[PDB]
């Protein structure tokens, strides 16, 4: 689709059979989800945003369907304030910015 920006670019994602709302975020290098359980090994990681650094759990090779487009990649889980789809998965679904 083409998504305009007068509203937040929130979309439905499917991850582990669960439907969630997530923000398509070109300013995010990584995909960061609110705390949830995901299967498999994770490793502790730290990431930084506008207000400082947080601790997250890094899960690799996780399938995420974003508005019906399939990605398989790294998902960080932690105290992000909102679910964020970052460039690591936006590139997999062929997302670009256009003006």
Ligand X SMILES: COc1ccc(S(=O)(=O)N(CCCc2ccccc2)C[C@@H](O)[C@H](Cc2ccccc2)NC(=O)c2cccc(O)c2)cc1
Catalytic residue positions, numbered: 25
Matching residue, tokens 């439907």: 19
Cβ proximity to ligand X, 14 vs 78, nearer residue: 78
Question: What mask of x and - would describe binding to its own copies in positions 27 to 56, judged by CB under 8 A?
Answer: xxx--x--------------xxxxxxxx--
Number of residues that bind its own copies (CB under 8 A): 40
Among 22-30, 33-41, 66-74, 91-99, the segment contacting ligand X (CB under 6 A): 22-30
SS3 for 24-75, per residue?
ECCCCCCCEECCCCCCCCCEEEEEEECCEEEEEEEEEEEEEEECCEEEEEEE
Interface with ligand X by CB under 6 A: which residues? 23, 25, 27-30, 32, 47-50, 81-82, 84, 86
């Amino acid at each position: 689709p083409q998504i305009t920006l007068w509203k937040r670019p929130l979309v439905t994602i499917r991850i582990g059979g669960q439907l969630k709302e997530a923000l398509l975020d070109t300013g995010a290098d990584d995909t960061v989800l609110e705390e949830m359980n995901l299967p498999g090994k994770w490793k502790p990681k730290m990431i930084g945003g506008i207000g400082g650094f947080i601790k997250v759990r890094q899960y690799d090779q996780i399938p995420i369907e974003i508005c019906g487009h399939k990605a398989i990649g790294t998902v960080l889980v932690g105290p992000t304030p909102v679910n964020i789809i970052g460039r690591n998965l936006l590139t997999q679904i062929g997302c670009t910015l256009n003006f």
